[PDB]
């Protein structure tokens, strides 16, 4: 279902602008003009088709995330929720951290 706006809106302008072998920096614009509580954002190893990791805590337009493996893919996604609920994910990103760390060869 694609109708119906019950909540507040995704956030845009999602990129990223620094990217670590163990973390990524990623940017976005709020998006919605009304006053939202906080930010929840979902990343998970691309490829499964499973459930996303969740953070929640974040009332800042700009995030790093942590805690991923060196030259590996991932997705991510923001979100904006408020004491209603929290609205649909931003356009998925893919980001590939670095291989600085460099844990294997082949």
């Known amino acids: 279902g694609s109708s119906g706006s019950s909540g507040p809106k995704p956030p845009i302008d999602l990129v990223v602008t620094e990217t670590t072998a163990t973390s990524v920096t990623l940017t976005w614009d709020s998006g ?3 006053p939202v509580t906080y930010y929840g954002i979902q990343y998970r190893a691309a490829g499964t088709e499973g459930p996303f990791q969740e953070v929640d805590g ?3 337009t700009r995030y790093s995330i942590g805690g991923l493996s060196p030259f590996s893919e991932y ?3 923001v979100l904006a929720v408020n004491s209603i609920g929290r609205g649909p994910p931003s356009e998925a990103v893919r980001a ?3 291989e600085q760390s460099g844990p294997s060869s082949g």
């Open 96 to 98: 590939r951290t670095g």
């Open 58 to 60: 974040v009332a800042t």
């Open 75 to 77: 997705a991510f996604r």
């Open 32 to 34: 919605n003009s009304e």
